[PDB]
């Protein structure tokens, strides 16, 4: 059995590592805590992390995820991708602290985006990354787009692209909520899928609780499986990471 | 139209490990709003990271599992740097992005592969100006490798064909006595001997380097960045002390 074929996947959400309320605020003690968990997990991680609320304000204001019909947009696109790449170095600099060795791989910097999609067209560089050991960590940036002069990709595709480049054995998306709701959805199966369709409720209608389950399920197969976690939980994390049953919503089984 | 390289040793201190000289890289960047010139801009790592590349040889490539967080340890110090140069070109008007070379690209026999040209491209067609930067890069024969600022220099010189190379240093230029002018006819006319030595500060591989990022019209210069208005003035095509070299 090869070196890497028991990679875990993991994203960490924006609104778990950065605190909305306030302006550019780093959540550092949970970031710590987190790289913590994941290195005492003693498994093979790659990170995700979203922007979270940098740069989510400057890119409301300014359409930004729309694309480009304005020439003022630039000062404001150039500040958001300023913004991420600044927070992924608060990031990086939590994981290095904790013995993980990883470098910031902006897709904003190398990559572009046609029709909310990302094409990632050239792998080697971040083939080469995962092989020496040098975690590479791609997050929610402005990416240059093929149609729309510019757009947002999302830590959350940003997950897909990965997780089809690097065929990992887990794929854990880390937020601040235990799980899906309908309450507690502890289980996402393809059949349990297909039972809810044939429930109406405006709480799973609204909130798209239904299409939340699909888009977990599309990144599963007969082995590989999708996790949601709660990080603001101390050592959630570390557990599932060693495969101990914990508070969560799981997928499994695949959508075919 | 104009590739400029702030060199490491101005925008940062090599007497400390983590010294950013602000007002410096904000005056340079003002000279270049205030210039009103198309600009694309790499810089030097400076000593955020040369202290650990050159206890760990991380130049010298990939030989042990102890060079691997000392790499990305460097890695995110010059990622840094960029972001604080970045930050003073943003607040002069001038939109930027950090475009890390480690991230972006590989290396092969000294040389900067870019396969992927579009991302820079667009970038630099929508205004957002792709800022590279010395740094660790993933190298397709030693594992990973260094990079250097007149590397990144030469890449971005074929890639978009700029009007004048400016070298952006803390020295007048090339000494002996300065050094006004630097051609081949200049360059041929130097008797050299290999048979002995004594180049005297390396002055002649410095003049041959400038001379291969110049053609039939486009000179590249080397000019002050500490002389305040000197990258202006340089920039709006004025007359100042510097060594230009032209072909």
Not at 123 to 128: A, N, V
């Amino acid at each position: 059995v090869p070196r890497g074929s028991h990679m875990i996947l993991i994203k960490l959400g924006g609104s778990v590592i950065t605190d909305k309320s306030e302006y550019h605020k780093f959540n550092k003690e949970t970031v710590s805590r987190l790289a913590d968990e994941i290195r005492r997990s003693g498994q093979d991680v790659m990170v995700v992390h979203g922007a979270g609320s940098f740069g989510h304000v400057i890119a409301k204001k300014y359409a930004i995820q729309d694309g480009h019909v304005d020439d003022g947009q630039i000062p404001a696109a150039a500040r958001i991708m300023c913004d991420t790449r600044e927070l992924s170095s608060m990031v990086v600099e939590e994981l290095l602290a904790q013995g993980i060795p990883a470098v910031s791989v902006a897709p904003g910097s190398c990559f572009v985006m046609e029709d909310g999609k990302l094409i990632v067209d050239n792998e080697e560089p971040i083939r080469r990354l995962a092989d020496l050991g040098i975690m590479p960590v791609m997050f929610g940036d402005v990416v240059p787009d093929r149609k729309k002069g510019f757009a947002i990709v999302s830590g959350d595709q940003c997950m897909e692209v990965l997780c089809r480049m690097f065929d990992p054995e887990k794929v854990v998306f880390v937020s601040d909520i235990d799980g899906l709701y309908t309450r507690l959805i502890g289980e996402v199966t393809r059949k349990k899928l297909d039972e809810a369709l044939t429930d109406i409720t405006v709480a799973d209608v609204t909130g798209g609780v239904h299409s939340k389950m699909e888009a977990m399920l599309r990144m599963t197969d007969r082995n590989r499986r999708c996790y949601l976690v709660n990080g603001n939980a101390p050592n959630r994390l570390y557990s599932l990471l060693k495969g101990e049953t914990v508070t969560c919503t799981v997928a499994k089984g695949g959508m075919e």
